[PDB]
Every structure is written in C-alpha cells, then in structure tokens.
Design an enzyme around this catalytic site. Structure first.
Site, PDB file in Angstrom:
ATOM      1  N   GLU A  35       3.414 -16.095  23.819  1.00 36.31           N
ATOM      2  CA  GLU A  35       4.351 -16.560  22.800  1.00 36.31           C
ATOM      3  C   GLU A  35       5.795 -16.448  23.263  1.00 36.31           C
ATOM      4  OE1 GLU A  35       3.702 -15.200  18.875  1.00 36.31           O
ATOM      5  OE2 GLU A  35       5.816 -15.160  18.297  1.00 36.31           O
ATOM      6  N   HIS A  36       6.163 -15.288  23.793  1.00 36.27           N
ATOM      7  CA  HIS A  36       7.486 -15.100  24.339  1.00 36.27           C
ATOM      8  C   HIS A  36       7.793 -16.051  25.464  1.00 36.27           C
ATOM      9  CE1 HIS A  36       9.198 -11.244  22.815  1.00 36.27           C
ATOM     10  NE2 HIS A  36       7.982 -11.201  22.288  1.00 36.27           N
TER      11      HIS A  36
ATOM     12  N   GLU B 193      11.326  -4.971  21.457  1.00 36.82           N
ATOM     13  CA  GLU B 193      10.701  -5.352  20.189  1.00 36.82           C
ATOM     14  C   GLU B 193       9.824  -4.204  19.671  1.00 36.82           C
ATOM     15  OE1 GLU B 193      11.455  -9.829  20.720  1.00 36.82           O
ATOM     16  OE2 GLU B 193       9.291  -9.644  20.544  1.00 36.82           O
TER      17      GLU B 193
END
Ligand SMILES: CCCCCC[C@H]1C(=O)O[C@H](C)[C@H](NC(=O)c2cccc(NC=O)c2O)C(=O)O[C@@H](C)[C@@H]1OC(=O)C(C)C
Ligand SMILES: CCCCCC[C@H]1C(=O)O[C@H](C)[C@H](NC(=O)c2cccc(NC=O)c2O)C(=O)O[C@@H](C)[C@@H]1OC(=O)C(C)C
Lengths: 54, 423, 105, 57, 446, 54, 53, 49, 146, 54
Positions: free
Chosen positions: E60-61, E137
């Site tokens: 995703e990143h 994160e």
C-alpha cells in the site's frame, strides 16, 4: 487529627450517639428507642444472673 | 438507468422566508431549517449564547418535552443535529420517508417553541465546558478562533465556543431573546430532501411566519488586523497568516478560491509528496523534517480571510512561514502559468462537484446559498463562474493578500515563530 | 358562586384552621411529605421561594421544639396561603406519567 | 457555493440527540498523519469518533 | 406520496460482468457528474504468515510511489491535475485502491488503477524510504489506545491463527521485508479471480466493461498450478489480555464473543440487538432520556466517556461485542451494565425496542449508502464477501423478519453462556477478573 | 385515639371470662380494630387531602 | 394503584419469563417433596419406594 | 510496536478439543462446558444428600 | 498565581509587558499554566548556576559590619560560570492584549517606550508621572492637584 | 446500578467475601480463619441442640 473520627471502632460510636445529626425537634416519644435498648440489656443482664441459679 | 432526475423547486415567500426542495425518490428524508443566527450576531454582553443554544436542541419545547423529543426521534431512528458557523445556525433532521411528519414537528417545536426552562438550562451549562474541551483538542480550533479575534474588531471575531468566563453564566432570557430576535422569517430558509414543495410551503406558511428580530448585517465586520500568540508546549507550532479578501458571492471570491487551489489545499493522494501543490513544494526546498501547509480561504457575507496555515517543528516555524509567504509573493509578482490556473480550476470544480455529491452536503449547500444569496445556483453555472476567472484575477488576488494588513495566530513553542512585522 | 360554595369554602377554611400548621407559620405546601416527585419540585424552586421555604420550616421546627406557636396575628391566614409548590409538583408528575406511559408500548 | 462551513475552512460545531458532538471545519492535519508523529489521545477526558447510527445485516 | 418500500424499488440494479480473467466488473449507475472507481482485492493479512506480515501494508505504501509507465511523481501528478482523489486501505481480509473523480474522467481513472494494481514498480530506493515511514506510523499508532486495544482483542481472541495478526505487522518484518518478499506476495495474491473492479456514479456499465477488458485483460492468462490461497478457519479463544498502565488517564476495554461471519443470516438480527444497545459519547445531547438503557445509565451516572457496540466479520468468524472508555473507578459498573443488557436481550427482549433497533438499522443502512464512494465500496466489497450485491430491498426484508423472539433466540445463540475474549489497556486495576466477567455471561434466574 | 382506646378495650375483654356482655363487645372491638386500620384511617387520609385541595 | 405496569411491553415481559417461573416451581415442588420425603407424592414415582414389601 | 505483542503459546494447558488452530472451538463448546457443569451438578447433588 | 491574579492589575500589567516586548521583559512574573508541574529540577539547577554568580550578585546588610559581609562574600559568594550581559536586550515591539471577562469595571493601561533607569530622561519621565498624577496623598480626596 | 454495592446490608457482605481484594498469593495456612468461623458456628449449633436436653 481527631482519633474519635478515624478509628475503625469509634467511627461507629461517633455515628451512633455523638456526631450523628438529629432533629432539634424530637420529643419524648422518641425516648422509647433507648428505653427498649436499656430494656434489652437489663433483661439480658438480670436474666443471666437468674440462669446461674435456675 | 436511474429514474427522472427532478428539478429543485425554489420559492421566496413575501415575508422573506425561502423554501427549497428536491423530490429525491430516496428512501430517507432530510430537512433543514437554516438561520442567520451564528456567533457573529452575539455581542459583548451575551457571548456564548449561541453555543449554549446550539446545545439545547432537545430541552423541552411547548409541543414536546425533552423526554419526548429524544424518545420520539430515536423510536424511528431519526437524528436531530445543529450546526453552527460564524454566520448561520442550521437545525438538520433526518429519517426515513414515512417519518418526516414526526420529525418536522419536532424540528418546528425546537426552532420556534423552545421553553428554555430555568432548571434544564442549569443542567446544560456544564456541557459548554465538555463540548469546548473536545473541540479545543485540535490545535486548529484554537488557532482559527484566535485568528478571527485578531482579524476583526467585532462580529466575526466572536468565538464559535463559549468564553470560559461565561460558562454557567448565560441565562434563559438571553436564550429566549436570542431566538426571538434572530429566528425570524426574513432570516430563515427551509430546505428539504425527500419532501415536497407543497408540504414544505404549507409548513412554512403555517409555522415559519414570525418577525420581530432585526434584519441587516447587524454590525458589519470591521477588519482590523493584529496577531494572537499562545505559548504552550504543543509539540509543533501551528500558525495561520491571513489578510482580508472577498465576500462570498463576488467575482473576486472565486479568484481567491482559485488562488487557494494554485497554492494548495489538502492532499489528493494518500501519502503523496503533494507534487502539484506549489506551497508545499516551496517549503520543502528550504525545509527538512516534518511540516504541512495549505492555503486558507474563508469567506463570509461581508468579508473574507485569505492566506495559509502552517504546522512545523518549533525551530523551523520561521523558515516554514517565510517560504510559504514568499511563494505567494512570487505569484503576486506575475510568475503564474496558464496551465497552472487551469489545473487549479480543475481541482475546484471537481471539488465542488464532489462536495455536494451526498445528500448531507447538498442540503447544506442549498441551505447556505439560500441564506447568502436568496437563490439556488446549479452546478453547471457555478462551474461556468469558476471558468470566468482570468489568470490576472488570481494574480491580483495574490497582490491583495501580499499588500494587505495582516492577521496572525500561532500557538506552540513560539521561540522562533516570527511576529507580523518581521515578515 | 353559591351560598353553599361558601359552605364548602367554609368547611375547608375550617379544616385549615384545625389542621393547625398555620400557627407554626407554615404554608400548606411546606408540609407535604417529601417523595421523589416532591423532591424534584423542591429542586425546581427559584432562589427566593426555596429560601423562604427554608426559613419557614426552620421557624416551625424551632417552635415545635419549644412547643410554642406564633402570636395569633402572625398565623398563616388561609386564602393568603400561597400554593407555591403545586405548579412544579404538577409538572414533575406530568413528565413522570409521560415516561410511565412510554414504558408500556 | 455558499455554506461557509463546506466551502471548507471556518469552524462548524454540530450537536446531537442520538449522534456525536462534532467540530469539523477546515485546516491541515491529514497531510500531517502521513509524515508521522501526530499521536492523538485514545479517549482521554473525551468522547468517540467515526460514530454510530450506520450498519447493515 | 412515494413510500419507503417504494423508494427501495427505485434504486437501480448493480450490473455485474466477468472478464475472461475472472475479474468481476461491477457498477451502479446514477445521474451524478462524479464517481468512484477502484479495485477490491481479496487480500489482507489473514492471508499472510508469521514472516511476511505487513507485506500488504508495505505494498500500500508503495502502490502510489511509481509504476513502470509512470515513475514517482507521475501518478500523483495525473490524479492531482485532473482534480481527482486517490485513496486506498487494507484490513485483515481486504485491500482496496479507489479514485474519486469527475465522471467524464472514467477512462484515465481506470487506466491508472490498472497500472497501479499491475505494474507497481517497487523501486528499491523507495522500499527503503517507506521502511522508515511505516516504522514511524507504528510509534504513532501506539498512542491511539483504541487502535491498540482492538489489535489486542484480535491478538487474544484469535490466538495462534493468522487473524490474530495485525495489518501493519511487527517492527522486525518492516525492518526485514525485502523486495522479493513483496513481489512474491503481489503475484501470489493480485490475481483476477480475487479482484473486483467497482464503480458508482455517472457511468454506463458497458463503458466500464470495455475499459476493464482493455486495461485489465491479461492478469490470469496464467491460472496457477498448485498455489491454493484457501483460508483455514480460525480458532477463537475465550481469553483475556490486560495491558496495565496507570499512567494513562482513561481505560479502554473491549469485550467480544465469537461471531458467525460475513455470510451468516444471523448478522441482521445481531445488528438489531446491537442497535438497541447502541453507542454513546459524552457529547451526545440528550442524556437521561436515551432509549438505550445502557446509554441512559452511563450518561446519568457518568459511567464513561464513550461506548460502542460492534460486529466485526471475517470469513466464518467474527468478533461481536462492545468497546468502551472510562475512568479508573468505573470499569466495574460499565461492565456490569453492559453485560446485564446483553442478558436482558437474550432472555427478555420486548417488542418495541426491537422495532427501534430495526428502524435504526434501516436508517443506518440507507444513510450509509450515500454518495459515490460509500456505494462503490459496498459493491466491490460485497462482491468479495456475498458473491453478489444484496439489493436494499432484500436487507429491508431481512430486517422486517426480525422481531423479539428472533432477537432472544439469536442473542442467546451467540452471547448466552459463551466465553468472552477480553482486551484491556490503561488504568485497568478495577477491570473485573475473567472468571467474574465469565459469570456475567449467564443469569442464575434463567 | 379510637384505635388506642379500642386496644385498651381488647386488653380489658381479653382479661374477662367468655360470657354475656364481654363476648359481643369483644367481638365488636375486633371488627372495629381491623375495619379502623384497613378502611377508616386510609379514608380519613383521603378526605383530608380533599379538604386541603391536595 | 399498580396501573403503571399495565401495557403491551409488560405483557411481553410477563410472557417471556413464563417458562422460567414455571420450571422454578417444578424445582421447588420436587425440592419440597425430596426434602420431607413426601409419603403422599413419592409413592407414585416408580422407584424410590423404600416403604414397600 | 505494540504489534510486537503476540500472546504466549498455551498448548501446554489447553483441553485437547482445543489444540488445533484450524479447528473452531464452537464444536467442543458444548462438550467442554457440559463436563465442568456436570462436575458441579454432581457435587451439589452430593452436598444435597 | 491564583492569589496574585485576584487583582485585575496583576493580569493587566502582565499582558501589558507581553504586548510591549518581543522577548525578555515580556516574560511573566508568574508561571504560564502550561508549565505548571512541568518545570524540572535540572531547569532549577541550571538556572541557579547560570544566573546566581558573583558578577550578578550584590550583598547588602543592615546591622551588620562591612568586614563580616566582606569575609562572607569572599568566602562564600565567589562563583562564576553563568552569563554576564543583558542576556537578550529587550526589543520593544508594541501591540495590544485584550481579555474579555465580566469583571465589573474595565481596567486598562496604555503605554509607550520611555527611558532606562539611570539616564537623565528617566527622571524626566519620573517627573512627568507626578505632573499627571500617581496615587492619592489625602484620604478620600478629589485629587485636586492631580 | 448494582444493588450488591449500595444496599446497607450487602455492602458488608460484599466487603466480607465478594469484592474484597485478597493476595493472589495466600496458601492453606490462611484457611483456619474460615475454619475457626465454621467451628464457632457449628459449636454454637450442636451446643444449642444439646441445651434442649441437658
Ligand atoms: C451498650 C450501650 C452503647 C449504645 C450503643 C447501642 C445503642 C445505640 O445505638 O445507641 C443510640 C443512643 C441509639 N439511638 C438512640 O438512642 C436515639 C436516637 C434518636 C433519638 C433518641 N432519643 C431522643 O430523641 C435516641 O435515644 C439507641 O439507643 O439504640 C439502642 C437500642 C442501641 O442499643 C443496641 O443497639 C443494643 C443492641 C446494644
Ligand atoms: C454466616 C456465614 C457468612 C460469613 C460472614 C462471617 C465470616 C466472614 O467474615 O466471612 C469471610 C469469609 C471471613 N474471612 C475469610 O474467610 C477469609 C479471609 C482471607 C482468606 C481466606 N481464605 C483463604 O485464603 C478466608 O477464608 C471469615 O471467614 O471470617 C469468619 C470467621 C466470619 O464468621 C464470623 O464472623 C462469625 C462471627 C459469624
């Protein structure tokens, strides 16, 4: 600090007849609660002395 | 293939009230009564009154007790909401098609028959504290509140939340007085989805007819300028720098709106470099570590605040602010390409389009348009209005931000946050 | 308005004087049994009423203790007896009943 | 395009009967949770977000 | 007057199409000028293993960081300039990448999705940069007590199974995952029969199909030999995790019972009972007068700051319960009350409260499906989970079926005398002992 | 007071042999007792309410 | 004045606890029986006849 | 970092119907509770006597 | 602070200094609430040791002798290691701070930069203040000469 | 609200053997407090039945 308030035992006694707030208002008809108490112990007390002979 | 897309019906009653509706054919209905009653109409002797008011939407009315409003509304799974801005309050109510009758009544009772019982409002005061605490948990809330208090001498400088000194001090009469002098026909508008015009119109003519408040811009914001700084040990320094711009509705307000999309206003891609954002890119050049920036643009009935908002590490505050500023200065100087403005216009257009995509956001647009312009302007024509902005307009906009008396609010460790005269 | 309505009023004025709280300076409402509803209405009184009610009841409890009463010209004259708590009590009862009624469906 | 609040930026509090008290106007923050270190509390002296009165089967 | 029943009929049917890839292509047309398209992948972290955990998250990143035909900026620049919004997310079972865009921009919208989903570059220098952002994160997520406790609920309830894992992974994986780890998870999981191109707005289904066939053809031109991505069922465990920390000001607790899972018809009824209990927050107006007995008691006696019931679904299993937040001396009361309510429903659901619950749920449903994005997401996700799209009307029929008896029967089936999975965090000294919480899952009167 | 005196009655009768006057009067006193506590006092109460306008 | 409890919901509440209240009397009867060795009732139970031939 | 927190293995204490991570525990739900409740039912039957 | 801030002047003058100066003299004589409970032992140690030094101290005494003072001073008051200058130098800025509150009366102070203690101009100012008026000389008087 | 905590009587009982926090740690040597209690009542109990015949 006043031990009469923080000692586990006295608390009870303070709450029973020392600091307990009561109506400035009650009259003689409220005495029979002590009288019944007194009656109960005196009864228990003479009653016992009779049992040492009965 | 969906059904026939109905047209929105709009109607101005002679007494000033506006009614607007759209037969949705949707399974749920949505009705709002929007009112010219926001904080700008409070004054130096009754601050916070509209906050407390905002929170009294379920105290007892004449036709319905607190208990009933609550139980009644939840019995059909409907909701009752109140939204405030510096200019309007908006009581919004929602439920399924078959239940508007019940909700409408409740809505009318709250908005036109509040009793503000002395004891119920005592029990409510404490919410002011809780409510504010929850809001003020975002650094932006406090910044923007300070921003408005520094920018304006009087009306728009009022706070959307009750000043602590008034907590527990706003009284039932202040509430009564406030409703009765601001919740009147000529300042109201009734919008509905999944409802009919005849029904709205009947309701409006039967229940929404009152007058006795005031009518004008009750003051007219006097832009002053100035700055408010609050030292606090937040981890980062939030700051907003602004200047007076254009009132909603004018062509210049769209120049500003376009300006904001040229500079940058929120991200379009999850976790991206903000490639096409020109403010972001301009700070990044000279600044390392974490930071954020966006153009800030806020327009009201008779004024506007435009500029940018930056969040940075305490030591880089100045560096972040100056790059930001210079950037804008660079577009006021003339350095703006046509393809740039073109891309902004796209973001704006697509943006507006998207903002009124759902029903809660469409109700709100129609409602605010009703109050601001007393009319409804379809998307095709807002788009057309956005296209009418020329590159020169965007530049002049910038010229106007740069040369205009400024207003600043910042909070954090301000050791390296500059004052206005140091810019 | 009847000759006999004055009779009912007369029976009432009669009971009042007999009931006797007026000799202690009380008002009819100063003598209601405190229950939830009554407690809530006591809560809703505006400062002055509440303060006045407190002073009254204090004055009676005080008298009651000395087993005295007020001079006759200071007794609560029926008809000058303000029913200051009824409207609240009545409203508190109404809302309870609405609840009670909602709980049935 | 009126609707101050939604024209993004100015603050707008929402209060409710069944739902949750909101403060949701516009300024940055989403582009701050990406370059990270924006903690946020976990229900400190507070309420709850995303909220309820939506679902399914 | 157009009735509610009737209104449900007016909602246009979702059109479904299958390519030769096995890629399902679905849409719901409306009059809107904007839209939402994206691909829903049957890929999560329940599909991961001890060692590649966080892979999906790591992808995703990278998904927007550059493709072969569009390196770095490129993507952003295409999306941003066309004024669209590019977004994505991933849970334990699903992954999605959607684009909000002007509906006249459907052609490039889709093109971009394909490229993203197919030609994800994964430049090594990026993988390194991203490694350090995800680490961060994690420090961040560690401060959201709520995010924490829900990971703990999952960690304890499904102990020893993949579902017990978190989406982002443990730090070491993020520290250790390699490009080879990624691409192999990609090819392993990003296969047509597990992807769903979804869209909602001003499009016509044919146009969508054309695009899907133009930019998506050739994904499963190779149906795999013996790679059998099958989900093993996940054990549930009546267990409890308490992360005591008296330095936090408020405690979060999350209690749940094993749920049935996405496809079980029992969901509808459970959702009704959940609606009955509902949620609460200290900024709700209307306190004492709330219909939810729990909520009203919590508000009058200040039992908490916020609570909320929930029903998480995964394949064949799920967590069903409530999560609350409160002061250190209220954890006991909140629990009592929460549990007493669960039992009341198992054994004494009255008729009207069920109507309210049903209406709430109808409101929720209809309200939730408002706008291109929420709809599009429901299409794509539902195709994954139900295999089809359940037309509003059908849900309305399912809800209508429910009444008191169904609630008592359905609640008892999942809650009555069942073993809870408790997760605690914060000043939890007063959080009741597991035995005690267990005992609260039955009544000696009944 | 009617209750008290009536109890004083029952006490007196109780003290007498089960014969002529004594029977019927102690039979009346009984009924009185139960009728007084079960019907009379509760009604006296309601009438007083009504008299006071309560 | 027990009219506060007269309504549809109460009627449903009452009915829900009917099986419980019933089974709870079954527990008490059998319980009383077993505890006092109820000669009357027990004679009827097939086994448990510790008073036969 | 709180995602480093795995729940320690319990195979060492688990009832046998519950050792499999791939087996739903709902199957042995009845059997397991039944047993322990039978244990107390018998017990109380014993005190009863 | 609560006890001090009970006089409206305390808050006014504190705001006055924060509006007048960019930096040093703008500091508050009372701790900002956000720091309450946040100032640490090292900050105290650091503060003493870099400001409580010989070159910034002075020892005065009444009913004491010079020799005693001097001995004490030479024996105990000899330390250096702090700083020495006007550690910043007040930058006069100007500006204004307004705090709405519902006190019964409005307190307000209006000011402009003047002269440092010690200069001749500072006495001009001091005289100016007695021309305009600075506190009363007679109990309950009209302030005739003010 | 949980009546097991606010009722004047239960309080005592809640404090005695329900909610009272105890060491996760005590061992068999701590049982003799209940045993002495049990002893005391059982003693009082058989003792009494002997007194109806003694
Ligand atoms: C041993 C003596 C210490 C006293 C503690 C026990 C005794 C006790 O608790 O004392 C207080 C005195 C208790 N209350 C009162 O007397 C009392 C209360 C309101 C008003 C009046 N009088 C006039 O308005 C009172 O007299 C009372 O009188 O109760 C007795 C029955 C109890 O006695 C008992 O329990 C027995 C079980 C011992
Ligand atoms: C009537 C029965 C209800 C119980 C209430 C009275 C009885 C009572 O108070 O109960 C609790 C159970 C009390 N404490 C404990 O037992 C106890 C405390 C710590 C640890 C253990 N065990 C193992 O670690 C314990 O067992 C205890 O055991 O005291 C008895 C002497 C008292 O008994 C008495 O007073 C007599 C004067 C009655």
């Amino acid at each position: 600090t006043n031990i009469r308030k923080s000692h586990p035992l006295m608390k009870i006694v303070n709450n029973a007849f020392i600091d307990l707030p009561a109506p400035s208002n009650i009259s003689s008809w409220w005495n029979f609660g002590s009288l019944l108490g007194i009656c109960l112990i005196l009864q228990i007390l003479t009653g016992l002395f009779l049992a040492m002979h009965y | 293939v969906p059904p026939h897309p109905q047209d929105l019906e709009f109607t101005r009653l002679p007494n000033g009230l506006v009614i607007a509706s759209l037969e949705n054919y949707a399974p749920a209905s949505r009705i709002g009564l929007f009112i010219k009653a926001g904080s700008r109409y409070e004054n130096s002797n009754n601050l916070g009154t509209s906050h407390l008011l905002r929170l009294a939407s379920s105290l007892t009315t004449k036709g319905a007790s607190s208990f009933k409003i609550t139980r009644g509304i939840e019995a059909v799974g409907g909701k009752l909401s109140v939204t405030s801005t510096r200019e309007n309050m908006a009581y919004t109510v929602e439920c399924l098609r078959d239940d508007v009758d019940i909700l409408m009544e409740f809505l009318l009772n709250v908005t036109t028959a509040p009793e503000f019982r002395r004891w119920e409002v005592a029990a409510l005061q404490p919410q002011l504290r809780i409510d504010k605490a929850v809001a003020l948990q975002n650094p932006q809330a406090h910044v923007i509140e300070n921003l408005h208090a520094a920018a304006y001498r009087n009306a728009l400088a009022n706070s959307l939340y009750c000043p602590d000194y008034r907590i527990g001090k706003v009284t039932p009469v202040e509430l009564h007085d406030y409703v009765q002098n601001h919740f009147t026909s000529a300042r109201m508008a009734l919008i509905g989805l999944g409802v009919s015009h005849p029904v709205l119109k009947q309701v409006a003519e039967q229940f929404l007819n009152i007058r006795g408040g005031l009518g004008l811009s009750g003051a007219k914001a006097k832009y002053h300028g100035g700055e408010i700084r609050e030292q606090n040990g937040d981890s980062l320094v939030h700051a907003a720098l602004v200047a007076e711009s254009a009132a909603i509705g004018s062509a210049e307000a769209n120049a500003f709106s376009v300006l904001q999309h040229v500079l940058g206003a929120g991200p379009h891609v999850k976790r991206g470099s903000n490639a096409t954002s020109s403010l972001y890119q301009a700070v990044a050049k000279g600044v390392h570590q974490p930071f954020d920036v966006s153009a800030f643009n806020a327009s009201y009935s008779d004024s506007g605040l435009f500029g940018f908002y930056t969040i940075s590490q305490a030591a880089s505050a100045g560096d972040v602010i100056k790059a930001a500023y210079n950037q804008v200065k660079t577009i006021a100087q003339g350095n703006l390409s046509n393809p740039d403005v073109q891309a902004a216009k796209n973001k704006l257009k697509a943006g507006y389009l998207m903002s009124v995509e759902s029903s809660e956001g469409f109700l709100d647009e129609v409602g605010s348009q009703a109050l601001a312009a007393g009319s409804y302007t379809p998307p095709s024509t807002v788009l057309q209005q956005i296209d009418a902005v020329a590159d020169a307009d965007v530049i002049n906009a910038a010229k106007k931000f740069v040369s205009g008396r400024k207003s600043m609010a910042a909070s954090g460790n301000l050791g390296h946050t500059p004052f206005i005269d140091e810019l | 308005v009847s000759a006999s309505s004055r009779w009912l009023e007369g029976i009432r004025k009669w009971y009042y004087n007999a009931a006797g709280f007026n000799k202690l300076g009380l008002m009819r409402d100063d003598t209601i049994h405190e229950n939830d509803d009554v407690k809530e209405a006591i809560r809703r009184l505006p400062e002055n009423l509440y303060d006045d009610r407190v002073f009254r009841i204090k004055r009676a409890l005080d008298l009651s203790m000395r087993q005295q009463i007020l001079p006759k010209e200071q007794w609560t004259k029926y008809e000058e007896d303000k029913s200051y708590l009824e409207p609240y009590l009545k409203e508190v009862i109404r809302e309870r009943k609405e609840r009670e009624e909602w709980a049935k469906k | 395009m009126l609707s101050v609040a939604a024209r993004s930026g100015p603050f707008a509090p929402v209060l409710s009967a069944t739902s949750r008290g909101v403060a949701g106007a516009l300024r940055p923050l989403v582009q701050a949770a990406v370059p990270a270190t924006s903690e946020s509390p976990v229900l400190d002296l507070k309420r709850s977000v995303l909220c309820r009165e939506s679902l399914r089967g | 007057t157009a009735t509610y029943a009737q209104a449900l009929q007016s909602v246009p049917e979702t059109q479904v199409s299958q390519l030769d890839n096995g890629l399902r292509v679905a849409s719901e047309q409306s009059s809107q000028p904007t839209c939402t398209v994206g691909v829903w992948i049957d890929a999560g972290s329940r599909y991961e293993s001890e060692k590649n955990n966080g892979a999906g998250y790591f992808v995703e990143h990278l998904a927007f960081k550059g493709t072969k035909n569009r390196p770095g900026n490129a993507l952003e620049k295409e999306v941003e300039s066309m004024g669209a919004h590019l977004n994505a997310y991933s849970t334990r079972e699903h992954t999605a990448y959607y684009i909000k865009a002007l509906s006249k921009d459907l052609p490039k919208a889709v093109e971009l999705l394909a490229d993203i989903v197919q030609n994800c570059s994964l430049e090594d220098s990026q993988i390194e940069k991203e490694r350090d952002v995800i680490l961060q994160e994690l420090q961040e997520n560690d401060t959201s007590m709520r995010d924490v406790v829900f990971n703990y609920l999952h960690a304890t309830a499904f102990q020893g199974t993949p579902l017990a894992q978190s989406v982002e992974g443990p730090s070491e994986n993020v520290r250790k995952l390699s490009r080879a780890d990624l691409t192999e998870y990609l090819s392993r999981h990003y296969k047509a029969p597990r992807m769903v191109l979804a869209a909602a707005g001003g499009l016509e289904h044919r146009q969508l199909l054309d695009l899907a066939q133009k930019h998506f053809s050739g994904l499963s031109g190779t149906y795999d030999e013996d790679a059998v991505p099958t989900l093993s069922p996940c054990r549930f465990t009546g267990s409890q995790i308490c992360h005591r920390e008296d330095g936090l000001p408020l405690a979060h607790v999350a209690i749940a019972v094993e749920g049935p899972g996405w496809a079980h018809p029992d969901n509808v009824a459970l959702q009704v009972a959940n609606a009955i209990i509902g949620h609460y927050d200290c900024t709700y107006g209307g306190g004492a007068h709330l219909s939810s007995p729990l909520a009203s008691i919590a508000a009058t006696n200040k039992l908490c700051q916020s609570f909320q019931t929930f029903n998480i679904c995964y394949a064949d299993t799920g967590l069903l319960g409530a999560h609350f937040v409160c002061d250190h001396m209220s954890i006991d009361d909140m629990m009592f009350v929460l549990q007493g309510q669960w039992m009341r429903l198992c054994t004494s659901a009255t008729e009207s409260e069920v109507l309210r619950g049903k209406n709430l749920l109808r409101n929720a449903l209809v309200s939730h499906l408002d706008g291109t994005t929420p709809v599009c997401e429901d299409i794509g996700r539902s195709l994954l989970t139900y295999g089809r799209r359940i037309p509003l009307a059908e849900w309305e029929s399912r809800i209508a079926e429910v009444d008191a008896r169904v609630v008592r029967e359905v609640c008892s089936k999942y809650f009555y005398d069942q073993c809870p999975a408790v997760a605690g965090f914060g000043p939890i000294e007063q959080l009741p002992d597991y035995n005690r919480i267990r005992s609260g899952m039955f009544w000696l009167r009944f | 007071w009617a209750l008290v005196a009536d109890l004083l009655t029952l006490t007196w009768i109780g003290g007498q042999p089960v014969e002529h006057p004594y029977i019927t009067i102690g039979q009346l006193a009984s009924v009185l007792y139960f009728l007084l506590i079960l019907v009379l006092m509760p009604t006296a109460g309601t009438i007083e309410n009504k008299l006071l306008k309560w | 004045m027990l009219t506060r409890f007269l309504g549809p919901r109460y009627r449903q509440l009452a009915r829900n606890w009917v099986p419980t209240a019933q089974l709870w009397g079954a527990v008490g009867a059998v319980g009383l029986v077993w505890a006092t060795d109820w000669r009357l009732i027990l004679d009827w139970v097939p086994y448990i006849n510790g008073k036969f031939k | 970092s709180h995602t480093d927190i795995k729940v320690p293995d319990f195979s060492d204490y688990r009832r046998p119907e519950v050792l499999d991570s791939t087996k739903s525990s709902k199957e042995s739900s009845e059997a397991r509770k039944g047993f322990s409740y039978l244990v107390t039912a018998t017990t109380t039957v014993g005190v009863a006597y």
